[PDB]
Structures are given as C-alpha cells and as structure tokens.
Amino acid sequence: GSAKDVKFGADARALMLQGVDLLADAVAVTMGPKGRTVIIEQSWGSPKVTKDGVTVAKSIDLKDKYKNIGAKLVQDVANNTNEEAGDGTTTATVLARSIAKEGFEKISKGANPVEIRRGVMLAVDAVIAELKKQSKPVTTPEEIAQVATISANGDKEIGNIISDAMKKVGRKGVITVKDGKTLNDELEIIEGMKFDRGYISPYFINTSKGQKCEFQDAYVLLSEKKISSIQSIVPALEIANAHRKPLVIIAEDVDGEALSTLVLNRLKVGLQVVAVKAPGFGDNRKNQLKDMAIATGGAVFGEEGLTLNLEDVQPHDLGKVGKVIVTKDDAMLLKGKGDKAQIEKRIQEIIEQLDVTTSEYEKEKLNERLAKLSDGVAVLKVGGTSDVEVNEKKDRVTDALNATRAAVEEGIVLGGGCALLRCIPALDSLTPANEDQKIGIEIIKRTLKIPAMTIAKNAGVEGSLIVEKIMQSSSEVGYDAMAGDFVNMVEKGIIDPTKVVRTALLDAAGVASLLTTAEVVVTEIP
Amino acid sequence: GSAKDVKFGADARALMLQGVDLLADAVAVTMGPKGRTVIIEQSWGSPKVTKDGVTVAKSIDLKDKYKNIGAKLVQDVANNTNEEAGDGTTTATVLARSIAKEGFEKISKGANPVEIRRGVMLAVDAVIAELKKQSKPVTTPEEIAQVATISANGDKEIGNIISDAMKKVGRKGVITVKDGKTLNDELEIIEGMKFDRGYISPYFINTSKGQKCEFQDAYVLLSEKKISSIQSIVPALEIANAHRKPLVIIAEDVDGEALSTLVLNRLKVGLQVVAVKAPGFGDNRKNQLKDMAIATGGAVFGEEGLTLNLEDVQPHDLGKVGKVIVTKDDAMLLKGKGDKAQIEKRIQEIIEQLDVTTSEYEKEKLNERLAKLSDGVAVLKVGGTSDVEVNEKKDRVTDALNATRAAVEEGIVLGGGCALLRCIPALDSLTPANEDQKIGIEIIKRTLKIPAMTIAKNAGVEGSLIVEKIMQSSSEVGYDAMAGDFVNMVEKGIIDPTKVVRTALLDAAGVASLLTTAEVVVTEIP
Amino acid sequence: GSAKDVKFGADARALMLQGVDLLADAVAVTMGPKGRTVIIEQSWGSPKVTKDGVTVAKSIDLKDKYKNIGAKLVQDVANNTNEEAGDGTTTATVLARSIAKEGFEKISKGANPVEIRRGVMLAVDAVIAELKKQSKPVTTPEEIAQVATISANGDKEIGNIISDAMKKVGRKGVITVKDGKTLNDELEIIEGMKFDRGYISPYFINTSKGQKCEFQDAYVLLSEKKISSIQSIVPALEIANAHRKPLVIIAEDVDGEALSTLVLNRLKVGLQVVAVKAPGFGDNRKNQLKDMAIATGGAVFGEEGLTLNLEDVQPHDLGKVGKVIVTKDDAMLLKGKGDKAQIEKRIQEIIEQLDVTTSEYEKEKLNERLAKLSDGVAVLKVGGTSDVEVNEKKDRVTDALNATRAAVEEGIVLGGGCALLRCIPALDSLTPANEDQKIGIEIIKRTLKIPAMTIAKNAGVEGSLIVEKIMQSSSEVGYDAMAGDFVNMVEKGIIDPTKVVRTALLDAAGVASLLTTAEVVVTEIP
Ligand SMILES: Nc1ncnc2c1ncn2[C@@H]1O[C@H](COP(=O)(O)OP(=O)(O)O)[C@@H](O)[C@H]1O
Ligand SMILES: Nc1ncnc2c1ncn2[C@@H]1O[C@H](COP(=O)(O)OP(=O)(O)O)[C@@H](O)[C@H]1O
C-alpha cells in the first residue's frame, strides 16, 4: 500500500548489490560451450529448462524488496539486450554486475557517481568505436554457419540448416521457427502466397492426382464481400472465358446461385474456375485481400470504404498469376504480377507497423510472411523427444537466427570475449576530465575482461590466467574453451556478431552506471 | 512477478534427485509378472488401483518444490512414453532414474554435462540401431497372443480375446475397450455403420420380434437440414416406390407434415421406410453425414455451399445399402456401396486430421470407427465384480492392445529386458570423442542393465546376479521371473514389441540427460 | 549418547564449505600492507581490534553446526600455523580455503579423495623442497629489520627496535613484549638475575647515592628455610670475612637474632653483607632459589631431601657472582659463576617443562628470563594512547618477533607471495601415479597463486592480472602492493621467513586435504 520504508547509502547499496549478485550468479552458469542449464518451475506445467540468460533473469524475483530492486534492474538490462539483438544476454548480465560492483565499491564521500557514470559512458562510446573498427563484414556463407553454430552452443546441424535456409531464402529473407512432431529438425521452404483455405467444392478438382485444382497463367478475382447468387459474378466469367485463362476467386464466401453457376460451367463445358474462402478473420481478412490484391496486381471488390462493384469489372481490375495450386485445406498462388515498387512499399508499411505495435496479435507477421513469399520463406520445424527439449533447442535456434541476422546486417568480430579485450588499449589512450571519469574508465577497463574469464571459469579452468595469456598473445588468437586450448579465433570459427557485443555492453553499462548513482532507496513495506 | 527462491549445484541436484528417486521407487514395484499394484486416492470417489507406471507417475506431485521438479520431469517421461507407445512406461521411468542418478553422480568441476548429454544420445542412437537389427517382424498370430498376454501381466484369456478380435477385424482394424456389466470379458463385433439414434416413430417397426425396423437392399437419403417440409419429401418417396426398395432417411429431424406422410403411407399402404435423426450434434453432424454419404455412395442434401435441394433427386443422388437394422436407441447400416477409393481416401483424411490435437478430439475417433471397415469394428467389454477391478483390468487390456499394435507395426524383440542387454556390445564398439561423451556412453551402458534387474528384484531374487548370468548366457536365453528360472525367451513367449523398448529408452534418456545438465534451480516460495 | 543428525555428500560438503568460506572471507581482509582490521566483541570489556588472522579465526564459531565444523577446521589450521611459526596465519587460512574449495569441486563418483590427498601431499613435499632451494640464510642485520618491518605491517620503528634488541641480546636470546605506560615504544635491557625483592634493612646501604647496596666479587648464600638464627649464619659470616669478600644472603626470611648480628657487624667494623627475602612464593620460590643456586654456583640450604644444613658450610657451597646491586624494591645479581653445561641443561629443562604444561601460570617464563639473563633479556614496552591500540600493536610486534626468529633459524625467501609462485615449475616436473593424484597436484598448483592475488586484491587492484604479470616477469621481481608497482623484491625489502611459508602451506594443505575426503557428516541436534 501507501506505507513505505527507506534506506540510506552503502547499506542499501549492499542489499541491492546482493540482489544483483544473486541474479547474475544464477545467469552466469549458462555462459559459453561448457556452460550449463537452468531449470525454472512453471506454475501450471512441467518446468522449463534453458541456457538463455534473459529467460533465467526474468524468472527471478526476490522477497527482499531491495535485492528485488537490483534484480529488476539486471533483468531490465538482459531484456533490453534480448529485444535489441536477440543474443548476448548472459554477457550483458555479467557485464552489468561487473559495472555495478566495481561502481559501488569506488563510491566515497568526495566521489560524484553521476560524473563517474559520465566517464563510464565516455569509455563505452570509445570502446564501441574501436569495435566497429575491428568489425569485418560477413562474406562467405561458411561464416554464417559459424556464427549460427556458435550462437547455438556448438550444434553444427543447427548452423548448417540455418545456412542452407538462408541461402535458399536470402540473407534478409524470412526465416521462422516452430515445433516439429518429428524427432529431427526439418527445413521447409514455401514459395508463393500460401494460406489455409481450400476449394469450397470438390467439383473444382482438375488433376485427380493429389486431388488438387492446378492452374497456370491464371487471373484472380478478389471480393471483400460474399458473392451470393447476384450474378455480379457472371461478367467476371464472361471476361474469363474471353481471354481463355483459368480463374481463381477469393471471397468472404461464395455460395447461393453463384456457386451453382460455377460448378455447372465447370462440370458441363470444362470451364477452368476455382473458388476459395477469404483467409478470413474479421478485420484481418481485409488487410490480407488487400495484400493479395497488391501482389497479384489488381483490386478488391466491395469495401466500406469506397466501392468497386462486381458487376463492372475490367481485365485490369482482376489479378494475374504465374501458377496456382489449391487443395481441400490450403491455397497457394505463385508468380503473381504487380508493381514491385508498390509491394516493397507494402512490406515497408507492415514492417514499420509491426515494429511499433506493442501487441502480440502476431498475425501482422502472418501477413508479412505472405507478401514476402515471392522471395520465399523458411519454416524451421525443430524436433526432439519431449516438449522441454523442444523449447530448449528452439530457444537456441532463435538465438542463432537473430545472431546471424545481426552478423549480416552489422558485422562479425572475434568470439570468446576477445573482441572486448582488444578494445582496452583504446581506453588506454583516453583523456579523462577528472578523477571521477577516470574511475569510470577504470571500471569499464576491468569490466571488459569479464566475459572471457567467465567462459573460461565455466570450463573449469583458471579464467584470469587465460585472460592475461590472451592479452599477452596476438590479436588474432584467443582461447577455445570447448577444445580447452588457444587457437586462431576466426580460423577456428569462434566469432560473435558485432551488433550483439555492442548492444550487450551499451545496455548493461547504461543501466548499471545509473544504478551506481543511488544514495537512497525507497520501498513498500510487507 | 511472483517472489522466488533459487538453489545452486549438487545440493539442488540432490533434492531433485530425491524427487526422482521417490517417484521412480513408487513406480518400479509394478514392474514384471511378480510386480505389485499401487492404490491412489481419488478426490471424489473410491480409490484407484493400478499397475500402470504412467498413472502412478501422474498421481504423485510433491510439497518440496525441487523434488516436485524432479517428479514432474519423470512423469513427463512416463507420459511421453505412454502417448508415443502405450506400454513401456515403468521401464521408461526406471531407465530415466538410472540415467539421472548415474548422470548426476559423474558431474564435477571440469565436466561438461551438455557434452555428456551428447555422448548419451550417441549411445542411444547406437543402441536403437542394434535393436532394429534384432527386431524380427511378427508372423504367426500366436505371437500376437504372446505379446498381448505378457503385456497384460500373464492373463492368457486377455491375449486370446485380443488375438480373436484382431483376427476378426484385421491387424490394423479398430479395436476399442469398455466396461462390461457382465462378470466376464466379452468380445462383440460390429459390422457396418452404427450410431446411437433411433426411429422417430414406433409405427416404422416391421419385425415385432425385438421391435426393430429391418430392411435389406435399401436406399438411404441424407439431409443436413430438418425435413418438416410439405412435400419436399415426396419425390424422394415416389422414386423409392418406383424401384420397389426400402428407404431409410437420416436427417437433422423429420417432424412436420413429412412425418405424417411417412407413417400414413407406412400404416395404410405398407411402404418400407424408416426415418431417424442425424447422429448429432452441431458441426459434427455435417462430418458424420458426409461420412455416411461417401460410404453408402451418394450425396447430402441441404446447405454446404453447393446446395442440392430435396425436391430434385435422382437415383444416383441417394445411397445404397446391403442391409439396415434400426431400433428405439440405435441405427446400424450394413454393406453400403460406394467407391472404396474415396472411402479409404476419407479414412486417410481423418487419420491425418486426428493427427493434432486430441484434447479433446474424441469424436474424431467416433467418426473413424464408423467410417472404418463397414465390415469391421471390435468392442472389448471387460468384466469383473467391482469398478476398481474393472478399471485396473481395462488399464492392462489397453496396454496389451497398444503393445500388439506396436508389435505388428514395428516388430518384436526379446522380453525380460534382455533386448536392451544384448545392445551392450554395440556400445562396446563405439568411438567416443572425449571424456565427457565416454561418461555418457558408460551411463547408458549401466542403465541398460536396469529393467531386467528390476523385474528380477520384484521377484524376490538377486536381480544383478540374474543380469550377469544372462549376459554370460547365449543370446536366445533369458530369465523367466514368473517361473523363476532361465529359459529360451522367444520359445517360452516372453517378448516385447520393439517400438516400446525403443520409445521408453529414447524418451527417458532424452529428458534425463537434459536434467543432468542443470546447475541452478529456480522455484516459487510457499 | 546424545541424539544426533547426519548428512550425506555434496550437500554437507557445500555446508561445511559455506562455513570455511565465511571464516576465510573474514580473515582474508587483513592480508598485506593494504589489508584491514577486524573488530571482535569481547564479553566483558571493550572490543578487540586485530590484523591477526588466527585471532580472527579463533573468534568465529557458527550456529549452523556443519558450517561450524568447517570453521573449526579452518581455525585449527590457523592455530597450528600460529603455534608452529607465529606468523603466516591469514596465509594459512586462504590456502586452506583454496585447497578445500578446489578439492570439493573436483570430487565425483569415480574420484578417490584419499588418493587425491596423497597427490596433494606429494605436491606439498615437492614445493617445500624447492622452497628450501630458494632459501638464502640471513646475514646482514638490515635483513632482520626488513623481515621485522614487513611482518609488522610496514612499521619501520618496530623492526628497528627489534633489530636493536636482537643485536644487544642476541639472535637466539630472550626478547619479551609487554604494555608500556609511555605513549611511545621503549626497549629496556636487563642483565643479570633480577627479581623483585629488596634489602630487609636500610642499614645495609653503602653508596648513599641512589640508596643502593652495591657489591662486586661477592659470595651468595641460599637458604630455602627462614633464618631466625640458631646462629647457623655465623660460620657463613666467618667464612666471608675470612676470604674478605662481600656476602649477599637470600632466604625465605632473615629474622630475629640473625638480622641483629647482620646489622651490628654491618654498622660496626664495617662488614660487607646484605640480606634479602626469597623471590617467592611457596613452591615457586624453591625452584627459583635452586635456579639461582645453579647459576651462581654453590648449593641451596634447608630441606629438599638430602638436607644441607647452614651450620656446616664450605666455600664451595655458597656461590660466586661478578657484581650485585640491591635497593628497597628489587635485587639484581650479575656475572654469577657456575657450570654453563648445567645452566643450559637447566634452561633446556624449563622449556621442555613449560612446553608440555598448560595452565596460564606464566611464572615458568619468569624463570626462563631469570636464568637466561646472563646473556641478557629485552623487554619491549609498547606504547599507544589506548589499551586496544596497545593490544593490536603488541600483536604485530609479537608477530614480527616470531618472524625474525624464524628467519634467523631457517632462512628468508621472497615476499609478496612470490616465493610460492616460483615453486610452480617444480610441480610442472612431477610424475603423478594416477588421475586422482594429478587432480591433487593441480589443486596445489592453483592454490599457490592465492596469497599474492589476495594481497593485491586487498590493495584494490586486479590481483590475478598481477599474479600473471609476476609469473611472466623474472624470478627476482614481484609486486610491491603498498607502493602499487613492480620492484626487485629482496632489494626493496619485501621478504618472508621460509619457515612460515613452509608451515602455513604444510598445515593448511594438511587439514584441508583431509577435509576434502569427507562423505558423511554427523552433528548434534540443537
Ligand atoms: N568453443 C568456444 N570457445 C570459446 N568461446 C566460445 C565458444 N563457444 C562460444 N563461445 C563464446 O561464448 C559466448 C556465448 O555466450 P552464450 O552462452 O550464448 O550467452 P549469450 O546468450 O550471452 O550469448 C560468445 O561470446 C562466444 O564468443
Ligand atoms: N514371465 C516373465 N519373465 C520375464 N520377464 C517378463 C515376464 N513377464 C513380463 N516380463 C517383462 O516385464 C516387462 C513388462 O513391464 P510392465 O510391468 O508391463 O511395465 P510397463 O508399463 O513398462 O510395460 C516386459 O518388458 C516383459 O519383457
């Protein structure tokens, strides 16, 4: 309630630090190839198992409200990093703890934690600069499989399947991931404009092999309203029999006398028509039919909303497609012709929508997969023998996917944690304005060493020996903690996307340096 | 979120292992011929009695949340096995515990439990290979009765009755199991298309013995809409009296003037018609009536899309059936004529439908029972003197049924637990990549011995003596724990379907090897 | 007996390790020049402040009986180290924790912790060997002041004053330490055989300057009984006036007519006698008079067994001393003649006495100072403005004293912690018999780095960076943590006695390696 309780200084700082340290200690066991999993109790079902830092971090709230404040801030950093990049979460967590501890310890009476924060931010800017300098953009699609396999915790089959899918769909094409029933992974590739609606009548079937309606060089008619008996349908058929092409009709429904005309002209004078229901869900179907309209080139009849009526059609009011296949369950349209400019406009609209949409009514992606399917889309059906396994593997696959996209879009840099280690000399050539800022730069200078020593510590080895051996060693070499020895990093394939290394550090330092500024904490009473 | 509490390392591992060990210890007493039952309190009724591993596992949740985590994972194993195979449950449980214990014990600081998991999974693949090598596909229907009787815990009458039903319905036909009212088991066989709806009026009755309407060489009319209509019924009767054959009419209802015409023409000019309500209800009736349509050859009237109206019928638009019997409660149609291609097509559709997501798609099985082999379904009415007896017995019968199907569809292999024991040499010829994987292969190597040693331990004998005596002995011989001595296994009838032995091991290792990877556990506070 | 409760495996190991880690964490803040003090509540008085590892360790018992078991064992190592060497205590604790942690972590199912102990002990033998190779025996008395000053936490005045006392009393002479009343330190040196008893009569005084009785080349008479004379004194006076030497008389008392004869012969015909009461009291006084007997030569009169009577004295039954000074409060005897063999036998007797006997009846040391005063003894009156200051400082002085003695008697080796670091290559050339022993040697190999990394960590610097920089650097150079930079170690004065470095490690590894062998813990119920 309204009643509250407050705490002052290094005592409260030590409590919040206890919370930070607890959550970080829980998260940090997952890090690297020799990292380990964390089980989390689920309220309704069987427990989650995960190696994902952020999903561990969000799962931990604390009874002690101050420790819970620390915990909430650390899961804030891990969540921000997962949102902005999709990997690098554990790294962001251990970094955030390091900045928070090294920050808290250096505070005194004469010290000015805000200015120290300023120094830290100077140092992180200076670091990401040198990171971008270090970045070398991806070229060979072997590097893709490397980034994927490393982000998937050494599963080569994952990074292989991601590499081939990314080849067959394109580096900025659509790849999505979902559960299999198969015990193994599967790559499915869809081409066209597929949606889960089938012919209204069996009588439309043409091949008898598969029981499909198969057409080529066809037109498409798009109706936002039902087409019942009105014979607003017939001109669309006269115009169709005119140009001797097959016709597909997509509508809210097609029934009454209209359908009877359709399967009479189909069954008696082998006319080539098929009719299918609009993909259909209330207001969503309008957006879908407008999508298929824009893709296939042409316009939707019926509206709210303006109105083009079905009685007055012209050949430029239809749609035009290279091929079409329909079954009892689903309809696929292929090589539809329209303005590519306008379709890229449409995709640019839906992506810019999706990005600002706050809402997990994810059909907006279901839209985006469709109109982008004229390049292709890949479905990643993940296997395994049990649901918890499937959720683990899928977490890792999604991580590797986001990592590969970050790699192609920004760059790749050394793995292990070496990429941050090499940035220390850039800090050595800084010019601090005052003691506080110098403390900040020192904090970052120590903090950069952390991820690599942590990956080594999880391996069971003397991590800080390994860090210093790496620093003494040349720029191209680092520590392979899985193989347990030093190697050329890029040659052995140990590499991290630059975007993730950037975002982990920037977010972690960003919230932790603010945390270190605290002098008074105010919390609700139990 | 909710306040939480976390635990680190071998302490938490020891707690989860306490839970696993408790649940496994409860489940494992049921194993084998000398196994024993477990009573489970029911909230509302008299207590359950069972020998089923999975039903034991599902019944046990634990107050200690960590132990409950272990327990939940083990019941996940037993449930996955029961879903995927239907018998191998106790085995999957004891296997899962063995992998979990032997896993947990071998972890240290330098160890890499993920890599150990990889080694374990390697070992399971290598084992299942040799299992498939060992598999000999079923041939004689004596072997059917053998797998059934062993899966039914030695009840010969069960495997006899299952053998009879499977003979008289076919190896991939439909057998179902239900309560008797009789003190003994009964095999009933239904032929045709039975459903639980009766004549609307008594006046339709023809036999006076049984009070049935009995027809042969009859026509059938299928209406999705009600027929209360004035004379939208009549042409359908004129066409029937024309070809002098009996007519059955199935509709949402027949109730208005139509019915009056029906029983006037019935009572005054003894025409052979009966009318019955559609099987019901709602959207289900559509699928059922289309099923009976497709089976009897012909089409459904009323609204689908293309509407065929009741006023315009033709003889090829009805249905044609070898025989029909109807009473007050149920209607059976027999030897209906239609394209067998189209009906097998339909069954192929419903099985691929039902594939997702039975909870609860129970009526999809009620459809498949109707539309599958219009010459072939079996009901297994199990007897006994009390409900608890009936339920235990029915659990065993369902187990034996699933076992017989797994045997017919994949194969049979040695019983006792010997089939897994013989796979050990295949592990002996493996080539582990590192120490961790070697630990994994060792874990599986120890774990394979468990089921046989457990079946012997339940017998009251020195199970691990028996295991080693078996291993020293030849491939064809194993331990008959009921008879208390060694015998040729296949000759004496002790055999297990390969599918269950495969799935138990695969699921158990699949979840337990993941469990062993845990380093931190996070649970809700009480 | 008492109801009890037992715990199994890594759970109990983690509990005991929690206790160890708590106590070690408390002790370890004291380490090195930048180390810090620990306040301990006293039950009766004002709280202790200390930098002494062992005194911190002894103060911490724990409510949780298992954690208390760990704590008890760690204070056991620290106490053993303090007893056997007198410094190196914090070091023994941090080593013990390192061996205990690294030990516990490496345990698994296949592991054999006793054999691991064997490997650890092998490693400790091998390291102390190389330590003895590194040792260079002390030479210049500058090195003394260096060892003292470093062991006194950088107080140069302490090591100066210790150097002075050790010069003027000898390297194996007696130095003792006690509270000053002065605000500054004082070195007092006593020569002779001093004790706190004065002339019975003022009339004995001869010098009038100071009011002392001063004699040279004198005789001494020792009587265990009172002398209220039967004129058992007169032959002893005739024998003294005969050989014209002064006579000092030490007795239980000098009384009655004896004293009258004494100060009559004193005030008249100026005879040179003095008489003083025995040092006292009771049975202690017997041992003291026999001590002075053996030192000054001659024999003690009165009843022991064989009774030597005062009536029959001979000059070889008296005693012979170079000088004597007595005042109202105390008596000092100087350059007493007797068998030096017999004197060293006597001190060797008293040390072997005190060493086995433990009532804090400290007079056995008061004996040792007396009979060893003919080399000399130094009292170290420590100053300060408050009792707590005096006690902390005195702790440090006693530490430096014991350290200087260990340095003189065994040797000196590199400070910082470098001396243990340089021994790692000696471990690198070992030949382990099996995996367990190899684990042990690895444990010691990691543990050797600890003291230096801890001294650096207390400084606020990246200790494990510093360790590796030191290892990369030459043998003669290490890290001056007070000055905050690398230096030649021996040149800068940072050096540790070899005995303490040996004993800390030997004790710590000795108990901790045994601790790691535990599988079951048994404790009393609260
Ligand atoms: N075989 C390996 N050797 C050395 N470093 C590795 C290896 N595999 C992965 N890494 C490093 O470990 C990190 C992977 O962290 P991860 O466990 O995925 O947590 P996050 O979710 O924070 O990425 C990367 O920075 C990568 O460079
Ligand atoms: N008489 C017997 N001798 C030896 N083994 C037997 C005998 N009867 C059954 N078994 C074995 O016991 C196992 C049956 O386990 P069961 O108790 O049904 O539990 P589950 O639910 O795992 O099937 C089979 O693997 C079978 O080989």
Ligand SMILES: Nc1ncnc2c1ncn2[C@@H]1O[C@H](COP(=O)(O)OP(=O)(O)O)[C@@H](O)[C@H]1O
């Ligand atoms: N200026 C210095 N530089 C490096 N090491 C130092 C310095 N002064 C002291 N030490 C180290 O500190 C250790 C003594 O720590 P101390 O606090 O006395 O603990 P302990 O009671 O275990 O001796 C010695 O090993 C010595 O080498």
Ligand SMILES: [Mg+2]
């Ligand atoms: Mg990752």
Ligand SMILES: [Mg+2]
């Ligand atoms: Mg069974």
Ligand SMILES: [Mg+2]
């Ligand atoms: Mg010391």
